[PDB]
Amino acid sequence: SMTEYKLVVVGAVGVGKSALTIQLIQNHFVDEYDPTIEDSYRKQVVIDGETCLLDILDTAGQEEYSAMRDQYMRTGEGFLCVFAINNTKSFEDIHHYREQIKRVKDSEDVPMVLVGNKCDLPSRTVDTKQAQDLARSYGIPFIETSAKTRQGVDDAFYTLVREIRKHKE
Amino acid sequence: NPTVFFDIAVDGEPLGRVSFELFADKVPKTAENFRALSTGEKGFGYKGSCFHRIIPGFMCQGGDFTRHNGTGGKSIYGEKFEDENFILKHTGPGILSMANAGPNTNGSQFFICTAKTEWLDGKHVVFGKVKEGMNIVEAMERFGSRNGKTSKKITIADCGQLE
Ligand SMILES: CCn1c(-c2cccnc2[C@H](C)OC)c2c3cc(ccc31)-c1csc(n1)C[C@H](NC(=O)[C@H](C(C)C)N(C)C(C)=O)C(=O)N1CCC[C@H](N1)C(=O)OCC(C)(C)C2
Numbered sequence: 259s260m261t262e263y264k265l266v267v268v269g270a271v272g273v274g275k276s277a278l279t280i281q282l283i284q285n286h287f288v289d290e291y292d293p294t295i296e297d298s299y300r301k302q303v304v305i306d307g308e309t310c311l312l313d314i315l316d317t318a319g320q321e322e323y324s325a326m327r328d329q330y331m332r333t334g335e336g337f338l339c340v341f342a343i344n345n346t347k348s349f350e351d352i353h354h355y356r357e358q359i360k361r362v363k364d365s366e367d368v369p370m371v372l373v374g375n376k377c378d379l380p381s382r383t384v385d386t387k388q389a390q391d392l393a394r395s396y397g398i399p400f401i402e403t404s405a406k407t408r409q410g411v412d413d414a415f416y417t418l419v420r421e422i423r424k425h426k427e
Numbered sequence: 428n429p430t431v432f433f434d435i436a437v438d439g440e441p442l443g444r445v446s447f448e449l450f451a452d453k454v455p456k457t458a459e460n461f462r463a464l465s466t467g468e469k470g471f472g473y474k475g476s477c478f479h480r481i482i483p484g485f486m487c488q489g490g491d492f493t494r495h496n497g498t499g500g501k502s503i504y505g506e507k508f509e510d511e512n513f514i515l516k517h518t519g520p521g522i523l524s525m526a527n528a529g530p531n532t533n534g535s536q537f538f539i540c541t542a543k544t545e546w547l548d549g550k551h552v553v554f555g556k557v558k559e560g561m562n563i564v565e566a567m568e569r570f571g572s573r574n575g576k577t578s579k580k581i582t583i584a585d586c587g588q589l590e
């Protein structure tokens with residue numbers, strides 16, 4: 259039998275939420291920016307030998323629609339919190355996401371993975387160690403990714419599934 | 428106050444004309460950018476560009492004539508200009524307001540409300556309203572969707588200044 263997982267992809271504008279999702283769903287990358295309003299996807303994968311149906315909600319980085327964003331967080335089971343490794347502000351934004359998710363879901367243990375994207379680029383401003391230390395303080399996994407090269411893409415989403423599965427048991 | 432027009436096309440077929448009153452009396456700098464982009468007189472402007480995001484029950488957004496993909500646009504003053512004022516509010520259908528990416532990032536992208544959008548007050552500069560052709564804007568919604576992608580190419584086939 260199958261298991262289904264409701265994943266929600268959040269993070270600041272332009273960090274690569276959609277590029278990550280499209281690499282997972284469609285196996286390609288383009289440099290063109292297509293700004294998100296809202297998109298949803300479904301994909302069947304095998305994780306840890308078990309068949310998994312992934313529901314992916316790709317949200318916009320825009321933060322001014324609290325009523326809708328709260329319902330994303332109520333419904334979602336796990337959250338991919340994305341920043342870009344060459345955007346320090348996007349890394350500073352991360353704790354706001356964790357705070358909002360804990361608030362809306364009324365829990366300090368929500369399935370969450372920290373994702374440092376665009377690791378292919380030569381313009382890093384956020385040290386891996388800084389992000390590793392922040393994920394440790396949260397007790398959550400940290401994964402560096404590149405939607406362009408596909409580095410870490412499967413790992414980031416599949417780790418999130420594993421965090422949900424662990425939490426549910 | 429100047430009046431400008433858009434002749435709206437759907438995959439190149441005429442839909443109809445939308446005309447706008449531009450509130451130069453209250454928002455002169457923002458009204459003048461839109462007027463001039465509508466005549467093309469600076470050598471660039473709205474003619475040929477598309478409405479890339481049409482969300483029924485909220486708004487029709489367009490104005491990216493530089494990247495042609497909803498990311499671009501520019502003003503007659505440079506790439507961006509500051510928020511001029513927030514005197515006018517998004518009070519209902521027909522309001523014409525500037526799109527932006529945060530404070531003081533006005534370029535050429537704009538939106539026409541199809542309902543009241545009061546949560547945008549104080550964040551987007553209102554500077555005009557539909558005069559004639561609200562039935563054309565309503566007809567544009569057939570081609571939108573919840574995430575704003577359009578099922579046909581909705582373009583400003585022609586535009587200019589009236590009266
Ligand atoms: C939470 C879902 N959700 C909703 C919403 C809320 C409640 C209920 N249901 C919905 C939709 C139907 O549920 C899928 C909205 C909405 C808006 C955004 C993202 C998600 C949204 C969003 C993304 S970027 C932006 N908003 C401002 C945008 N800026 C750019 O496009 C720039 C350009 C100019 C360079 N750009 C590309 C970047 C990145 O900044 C801009 O100026 N306007 C001009 C004003 C209307 C506005 N777009 C827009 O489209 O509102 C959509 C609207 C009104 C439905 C609100």
Ligand SMILES: Nc1nc2c(ncn2[C@@H]2O[C@H](COP(=O)(O)OP(=O)(O)NP(=O)(O)O)[C@@H](O)[C@H]2O)c(=O)[nH]1
Binds near residue numbers: 292379407
């Ligand atoms: N080099 C490189 N560019 C990337 C990477 N991920 C995304 N980009 C680029 O960064 C831009 C923004 O990506 P996008 O996925 O649209 O970001 P987003 O977070 O979904 N933006 P939004 O908040 O508007 O929905 C695009 O030009 C895209 O090609 C990456 O890993 N490496």
Ligand SMILES: [Mg+2]
Binds near residue numbers: 276277294316
């Ligand atoms: Mg996106």
